[PDB]
């Protein structure tokens, strides 16, 4: 299995790593129908989503989507430094696949 | 694919953005039958609810309603500044659709 | 749809409001069979339960009972001031229907 | 319903109260098959488990077992003083039935 | 019924204890399909995973896998010292079976 986010990210089509090394600037979440999602930004303007669960996701990803939103909310509230995001870049905002936190 | 809470809010009828830029002043939650809900207020007095789940909600919203109550509680306890709420204004208190937090 | 805990409480028979304006003094929780419940006290001696889920409860209250126990535990651990409790007074200890927190 | 952990404990055979009045010294948890359990210790060496869910438990206890592990983890991390444990002392280590926390 | 992580770990084949006595240096989590996993590292370079749930896991392990990822995230965020990990050594990175925290 991959040993880090960069190696994990490389296993997928249409992805890239963004290196932030910064805390989350804003956290947004929605319960509106068909927009049950989270959006984060950083002070540099970079904006990312956790996608609404859909047909593009296999069953095993559903629990992981819910965990990711949990992770982003607590990272935001604790001012935890986000190291990198692995994202899909065929979505706008880019869609989070993985997160690493360090320092 | 909203970039932010304002754009997301604008996808729905009967909504508006409240800009608070302040911590939650009070947090109330109920397990009473047919009133399984949360209510928050801000220091100015403004009051908002997370609605009881009902027939106006699609299935995918159910998990998101539970998440929103989780978010409001932890935001309250951590004194996190709420930037904006997207709310449905055809309810009283106005009903929360989305929240943004920023320092 | 109520603006506050006092108005919510008044919608039900066998209820009353306790105004505590104090942090929780003790938090007790049990996983023993037929006593899967929480009990809290305040410095003044006042004691309250979250009831064991039972046939008096409608399905929609089940998730809310679990949320209330979550709320009491974190309120206790963070020393959050409890403003009011709405309780059913036909049980001993009085059974929590709703909580409000404000400083 | 019982008003406190001592009275609750007394409703069950093969139990006792341990009065600790101390924070948890160590927290251990396992996902290994048939040992999906938690173990805590105190500085005096006293050791307790949350048992693996089994046939001795009724269905209503399953959620409560999961909650208890949640409570012990956060008690451990916040250095919350444990007042008492109600345990079954027909198991080694003694098996937790209930916990009380008071400052 | 084990009283500590070392004895628990020894009940299984293909396991070993790693003694860290250090906080987690990095926390990584992925929602990408077939890589719904967590990875942690320590400042000594040591890397561990929580495996993707799979055929090797019995049903009772599923909830425990989810709990372990919750535990690692909060341990990371609170800078809690990890004492030991029990891991399976027939995976790369080694796969977490149990964790102990002390001091």
């Amino acid at each position: 299995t991959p040993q880090n986010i960069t190696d994990l990210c490389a296993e997928y089509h249409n992805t890239q790593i963004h290196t932030l090394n910064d805390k989350i600037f804003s956290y947004t979440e929605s319960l509106a129908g068909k927009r049950e999602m989270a959006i984060i930004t950083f002070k540099n303007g970079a904006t990312f989503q956790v996608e609404v669960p859909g047909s593009q996701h296999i069953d095993s990803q559903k629990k992981a989507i819910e965990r990711m939103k949990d992770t982003l909310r607590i990272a935001y509230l604790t001012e935890a430094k986000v190291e990198k995001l692995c994202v899909w870049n065929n979505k706008t905002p880019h869609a989070i696949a993985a997160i690493s936190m360090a320092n």
Side-chain angles (χ1 to χ4, degrees), chain A residues 5-58:
Chain A
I5 189 168
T6 296
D7 290 345
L8 188 150
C9 205
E11 302 188 340
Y12 294 87
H13 305 130
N14 298 127
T15 61
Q16 70 198 71
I17 289 285
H18 295 231
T19 301
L20 278 308
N21 284 321
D22 198 14
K23 69 181 187 178
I24 298 167
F25 179 82
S26 74
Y27 175 88
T28 297
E29 84 179 33
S30 166
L31 61 77
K34 311 295 189 187
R35 292 294 197 203
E36 309 89 349
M37 72 184 292
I39 303 164
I40 59 170
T41 73
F42 294 86
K43 191 75 173 299
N44 58 16
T47 301
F48 305 97
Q49 64 169 312
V50 180
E51 289 185 88
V52 177
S55 212
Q56 71 265 226
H57 298 123
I58 65 180

Coordinates of all heavy atoms in Angstrom, one line a residue, chain A residues 5-58:
Chain A
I5 N 0.9 10.4 0.9 CA -0.2 11.0 0.1 C 0.2 11.1 -1.4 O -0.6 11.0 -2.3 CB -0.7 12.3 0.7 CG1 -1.9 12.7 0.0 CG2 0.4 13.4 0.7 CD1 -2.6 13.9 0.7
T6 N 1.5 11.4 -1.6 CA 1.9 11.7 -3.0 C 1.9 10.4 -3.8 O 1.4 10.4 -5.0 CB 3.3 12.3 -3.0 OG1 3.3 13.6 -2.3 CG2 3.8 12.5 -4.4
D7 N 2.4 9.3 -3.2 CA 2.3 8.0 -3.9 C 0.9 7.5 -4.1 O 0.5 6.9 -5.1 CB 3.2 7.0 -3.1 CG 4.7 7.3 -3.1 OD1 5.1 8.1 -4.0 OD2 5.5 6.9 -2.3
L8 N 0.0 7.8 -3.1 CA -1.4 7.4 -3.2 C -2.0 8.2 -4.3 O -2.7 7.6 -5.2 CB -2.1 7.7 -1.9 CG -3.5 7.2 -1.7 CD1 -3.8 6.9 -0.3 CD2 -4.5 8.2 -2.3
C9 N -1.8 9.5 -4.4 CA -2.4 10.3 -5.4 C -2.0 9.9 -6.8 O -2.9 9.9 -7.7 CB -2.0 11.8 -5.1 SG -3.1 13.0 -5.8
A10 N -0.8 9.4 -7.0 CA -0.3 9.0 -8.3 C -1.0 7.8 -8.9 O -0.9 7.5 -10.0 CB 1.2 8.8 -8.2
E11 N -1.7 7.1 -8.0 CA -2.4 5.9 -8.5 C -3.7 6.2 -9.2 O -4.3 5.3 -9.8 CB -2.8 4.9 -7.3 CG -1.6 4.5 -6.5 CD -1.9 3.4 -5.5 OE1 -3.1 3.3 -5.1 OE2 -1.0 2.7 -5.0
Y12 N -4.1 7.5 -9.3 CA -5.4 7.8 -9.9 C -5.3 8.8 -11.0 O -4.4 9.6 -11.1 CB -6.3 8.5 -8.8 CG -6.6 7.5 -7.7 CD1 -5.8 7.3 -6.6 CD2 -7.7 6.7 -7.8 CE1 -6.1 6.4 -5.6 CE2 -8.0 5.8 -6.8 CZ -7.2 5.6 -5.7 OH -7.4 4.7 -4.8
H13 N -6.2 8.6 -12.0 CA -6.3 9.6 -13.1 C -6.8 10.9 -12.7 O -7.6 11.0 -11.7 CB -7.2 9.0 -14.2 CG -6.8 7.7 -14.7 ND1 -7.8 6.7 -14.8 CD2 -5.7 7.2 -15.2 CE1 -7.2 5.6 -15.3 NE2 -5.9 5.9 -15.5
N14 N -6.4 12.0 -13.4 CA -7.0 13.3 -13.2 C -6.8 13.9 -11.8 O -7.6 14.5 -11.2 CB -8.5 13.3 -13.5 CG -8.8 12.9 -14.9 OD1 -9.6 12.0 -15.1 ND2 -8.2 13.6 -15.9
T15 N -5.6 13.5 -11.2 CA -5.3 14.1 -9.8 C -4.0 14.9 -9.9 O -3.2 14.8 -10.8 CB -5.1 13.0 -8.8 OG1 -4.0 12.1 -9.2 CG2 -6.3 12.1 -8.6
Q16 N -3.9 15.7 -8.8 CA -2.6 16.4 -8.5 C -2.5 16.7 -7.0 O -3.6 16.7 -6.3 CB -2.5 17.7 -9.3 CG -3.5 18.8 -8.8 CD -3.6 19.9 -9.9 OE1 -4.3 19.6 -10.9 NE2 -3.1 21.0 -9.6
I17 N -1.3 16.9 -6.6 CA -1.0 17.4 -5.2 C -1.0 18.9 -5.2 O -0.3 19.5 -6.1 CB 0.3 16.8 -4.8 CG1 0.2 15.3 -4.5 CG2 0.8 17.5 -3.5 CD1 -0.5 14.9 -3.2
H18 N -1.6 19.5 -4.2 CA -1.4 20.9 -3.8 C -0.7 20.9 -2.5 O -1.1 20.2 -1.6 CB -2.8 21.7 -3.7 CG -3.6 21.8 -4.9 ND1 -4.0 23.1 -5.3 CD2 -4.0 20.9 -5.8 CE1 -4.7 22.9 -6.4 NE2 -4.7 21.6 -6.8
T19 N 0.4 21.6 -2.3 CA 1.0 21.8 -1.1 C 0.6 23.1 -0.5 O 0.9 24.2 -1.0 CB 2.6 21.7 -1.3 OG1 2.9 20.4 -1.9 CG2 3.3 21.8 0.0
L20 N 0.0 23.0 0.7 CA -0.5 24.2 1.4 C 0.4 24.6 2.5 O 0.7 25.8 2.6 CB -1.9 23.9 1.9 CG -3.1 24.1 0.9 CD1 -3.1 25.4 0.2 CD2 -3.1 22.9 0.0
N21 N 0.8 23.7 3.4 CA 1.5 24.0 4.6 C 0.9 25.2 5.3 O 1.6 26.1 5.7 CB 3.0 24.1 4.3 CG 3.6 22.7 4.1 OD1 3.3 21.8 4.8 ND2 4.6 22.6 3.1
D22 N -0.4 25.1 5.5 CA -1.1 26.2 6.1 C -2.4 25.7 6.8 O -2.9 24.7 6.4 CB -1.5 27.3 5.1 CG -1.8 28.6 5.7 OD1 -1.6 28.9 6.9 OD2 -2.3 29.5 5.0
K23 N -2.9 26.4 7.8 CA -4.2 26.1 8.3 C -5.3 26.5 7.3 O -5.1 27.3 6.4 CB -4.5 26.8 9.6 CG -4.6 28.3 9.5 CD -4.8 28.9 10.9 CE -5.1 30.4 10.9 NZ -5.4 31.0 12.3
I24 N -6.5 25.9 7.5 CA -7.7 26.2 6.7 C -8.2 27.6 7.1 O -8.3 27.9 8.3 CB -8.7 25.2 6.9 CG1 -8.2 23.8 6.4 CG2 -10.0 25.6 6.2 CD1 -9.1 22.6 6.9
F25 N -8.4 28.4 6.1 CA -8.9 29.8 6.3 C -10.4 29.9 6.5 O -10.9 30.6 7.4 CB -8.5 30.7 5.1 CG -9.1 32.1 5.2 CD1 -8.4 33.0 6.0 CD2 -10.2 32.4 4.6 CE1 -8.9 34.3 6.1 CE2 -10.7 33.7 4.7 CZ -10.1 34.6 5.5
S26 N -11.2 29.1 5.7 CA -12.6 29.0 5.9 C -13.1 27.6 5.7 O -12.6 26.8 4.9 CB -13.4 30.0 5.0 OG -13.4 29.5 3.6
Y27 N -14.2 27.3 6.4 CA -14.9 26.0 6.3 C -16.4 26.2 6.1 O -17.0 27.0 6.9 CB -14.7 25.1 7.6 CG -15.5 23.9 7.6 CD1 -14.9 22.7 7.0 CD2 -16.7 23.8 8.1 CE1 -15.7 21.5 6.9 CE2 -17.5 22.6 8.0 CZ -16.9 21.5 7.5 OH -17.7 20.3 7.3
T28 N -16.9 25.6 5.1 CA -18.4 25.8 4.8 C -19.0 24.4 4.6 O -18.4 23.5 4.0 CB -18.5 26.5 3.4 OG1 -17.9 27.9 3.6 CG2 -19.9 26.7 3.0
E29 N -20.2 24.2 5.2 CA -20.9 23.0 4.9 C -22.4 23.3 4.7 O -22.9 24.3 5.2 CB -20.6 21.9 6.0 CG -21.5 22.0 7.2 CD -21.2 21.0 8.2 OE1 -20.1 20.5 8.4 OE2 -22.2 20.6 8.9
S30 N -23.0 22.4 3.9 CA -24.4 22.6 3.4 C -25.2 21.3 3.6 O -24.7 20.2 3.3 CB -24.3 22.9 2.0 OG -25.6 22.8 1.3
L31 N -26.4 21.5 4.0 CA -27.4 20.4 4.1 C -28.5 20.6 3.0 O -29.5 19.9 3.0 CB -28.0 20.3 5.5 CG -28.8 21.5 6.0 CD1 -30.2 21.7 5.4 CD2 -29.0 21.3 7.5
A32 N -28.3 21.6 2.1 CA -29.3 21.8 1.0 C -29.3 20.6 0.1 O -28.3 20.0 -0.2 CB -29.0 23.1 0.3
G33 N -30.5 20.3 -0.4 CA -30.6 19.2 -1.2 C -29.8 19.2 -2.5 O -29.9 20.1 -3.3
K34 N -29.1 18.1 -2.7 CA -28.2 17.9 -3.9 C -26.9 18.7 -3.7 O -26.1 18.7 -4.7 CB -28.8 18.2 -5.2 CG -30.2 17.5 -5.4 CD -30.0 16.0 -5.5 CE -31.4 15.4 -5.9 NZ -31.3 13.9 -5.8
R35 N -26.8 19.4 -2.6 CA -25.5 20.1 -2.3 C -25.0 19.8 -0.9 O -24.6 20.7 -0.2 CB -25.7 21.6 -2.5 CG -25.9 22.0 -4.0 CD -24.7 21.8 -4.9 NE -24.8 22.5 -6.1 CZ -24.1 22.2 -7.2 NH1 -23.4 21.1 -7.3 NH2 -24.3 23.0 -8.3
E36 N -25.2 18.6 -0.5 CA -24.7 18.1 0.8 C -23.2 17.9 0.7 O -22.7 16.8 0.4 CB -25.4 16.9 1.2 CG -27.0 16.9 1.1 CD -27.6 16.5 -0.2 OE1 -26.8 16.4 -1.2 OE2 -28.8 16.3 -0.3
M37 N -22.4 19.0 0.9 CA -21.0 19.1 0.6 C -20.3 20.0 1.6 O -21.0 20.7 2.4 CB -20.9 19.6 -0.8 CG -21.2 21.1 -0.9 SD -21.1 21.8 -2.6 CE -19.3 21.7 -3.0
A38 N -19.0 20.0 1.6 CA -18.2 20.9 2.3 C -17.3 21.6 1.3 O -16.9 21.0 0.3 CB -17.3 20.2 3.4
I39 N -16.9 22.8 1.7 CA -16.0 23.6 0.8 C -15.0 24.2 1.8 O -15.4 24.8 2.9 CB -16.7 24.8 0.1 CG1 -17.9 24.3 -0.7 CG2 -15.7 25.6 -0.7 CD1 -18.8 25.4 -1.2
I40 N -13.7 24.2 1.5 CA -12.7 24.9 2.3 C -11.9 25.8 1.4 O -11.7 25.6 0.2 CB -11.7 23.9 3.0 CG1 -11.0 23.0 2.0 CG2 -12.5 23.0 4.0 CD1 -9.8 22.2 2.6
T41 N -11.4 26.9 2.1 CA -10.4 27.7 1.4 C -9.2 28.0 2.3 O -9.3 27.8 3.5 CB -11.0 29.1 1.0 OG1 -11.2 29.9 2.1 CG2 -12.4 28.9 0.3
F42 N -8.1 28.4 1.6 CA -6.9 28.8 2.3 C -6.7 30.3 2.0 O -7.4 30.9 1.1 CB -5.7 28.0 1.8 CG -5.9 26.6 2.2 CD1 -6.6 25.6 1.5 CD2 -5.3 26.1 3.4 CE1 -6.8 24.3 1.9 CE2 -5.5 24.8 3.9 CZ -6.2 23.9 3.1
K43 N -5.9 31.0 2.8 CA -5.7 32.4 2.7 C -5.2 32.8 1.3 O -5.4 34.0 0.9 CB -4.7 32.9 3.8 CG -4.6 34.4 4.0 CD -5.9 35.0 4.7 CE -5.7 36.4 5.1 NZ -4.5 36.6 6.0
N44 N -4.6 31.9 0.6 CA -4.1 32.2 -0.8 C -5.2 32.2 -1.8 O -5.0 32.4 -3.0 CB -3.0 31.3 -1.2 CG -3.4 29.8 -1.1 OD1 -4.5 29.5 -1.0 ND2 -2.4 28.9 -1.1
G45 N -6.4 31.9 -1.4 CA -7.6 31.9 -2.3 C -8.0 30.5 -2.8 O -9.0 30.2 -3.4
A46 N -7.1 29.5 -2.6 CA -7.3 28.1 -3.1 C -8.5 27.6 -2.4 O -8.7 27.7 -1.2 CB -6.1 27.3 -2.8
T47 N -9.4 27.0 -3.2 CA -10.7 26.5 -2.8 C -10.9 25.0 -3.2 O -10.5 24.7 -4.4 CB -11.8 27.3 -3.5 OG1 -11.6 28.7 -3.1 CG2 -13.2 27.0 -3.1
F48 N -11.4 24.3 -2.3 CA -11.5 22.8 -2.5 C -12.9 22.4 -2.0 O -13.4 22.9 -1.0 CB -10.4 22.1 -1.8 CG -9.0 22.5 -2.2 CD1 -8.3 23.5 -1.5 CD2 -8.5 22.1 -3.4 CE1 -7.1 23.9 -1.9 CE2 -7.3 22.5 -3.8 CZ -6.6 23.4 -3.1
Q49 N -13.4 21.3 -2.6 CA -14.7 20.7 -2.2 C -14.5 19.2 -1.7 O -13.6 18.6 -2.2 CB -15.7 20.7 -3.3 CG -15.4 19.9 -4.5 CD -16.6 19.8 -5.5 OE1 -17.7 19.4 -5.1 NE2 -16.4 20.0 -6.8
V50 N -15.3 18.8 -0.8 CA -15.7 17.4 -0.7 C -17.0 17.2 -1.5 O -18.0 17.9 -1.1 CB -15.9 16.9 0.8 CG1 -16.2 15.5 0.8 CG2 -14.6 17.2 1.6
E51 N -17.0 16.4 -2.5 CA -18.1 16.3 -3.4 C -19.3 15.7 -2.7 O -19.2 14.9 -1.8 CB -17.7 15.4 -4.6 CG -16.8 16.0 -5.6 CD -16.6 15.1 -6.8 OE1 -17.3 15.2 -7.8 OE2 -15.7 14.2 -6.8
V52 N -20.5 16.1 -3.2 CA -21.7 15.4 -2.9 C -21.6 13.9 -3.3 O -21.1 13.7 -4.4 CB -22.9 16.1 -3.7 CG1 -24.2 15.3 -3.4 CG2 -23.0 17.6 -3.3
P53 N -21.9 13.0 -2.4 CA -21.9 11.6 -2.8 C -22.7 11.3 -4.1 O -23.8 11.8 -4.2 CB -22.4 10.9 -1.6 CG -22.2 11.8 -0.5 CD -22.4 13.2 -1.0
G54 N -22.2 10.6 -5.0 CA -22.9 10.3 -6.2 C -22.4 9.0 -6.9 O -21.7 8.2 -6.3
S55 N -22.9 8.9 -8.1 CA -22.6 7.6 -8.9 C -21.2 7.4 -9.2 O -20.8 6.3 -9.6 CB -23.4 7.7 -10.2 OG -23.8 6.4 -10.5
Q56 N -20.4 8.4 -9.1 CA -18.9 8.4 -9.3 C -18.2 7.7 -8.1 O -17.0 7.4 -8.2 CB -18.3 9.8 -9.5 CG -18.3 10.7 -8.3 CD -19.5 11.6 -8.2 OE1 -19.3 12.8 -8.0 NE2 -20.6 11.1 -8.4
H57 N -18.9 7.5 -7.1 CA -18.3 6.9 -5.9 C -18.8 5.5 -5.6 O -20.0 5.2 -5.7 CB -18.8 7.7 -4.7 CG -18.3 9.1 -4.7 ND1 -19.2 10.2 -4.6 CD2 -17.1 9.7 -4.7 CE1 -18.5 11.3 -4.6 NE2 -17.2 11.1 -4.7
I58 N -17.9 4.6 -5.3 CA -18.2 3.2 -4.9 C -18.7 3.2 -3.4 O -18.4 4.2 -2.7 CB -17.1 2.2 -5.2 CG1 -15.9 2.5 -4.4 CG2 -16.8 2.2 -6.7 CD1 -14.7 1.5 -4.6

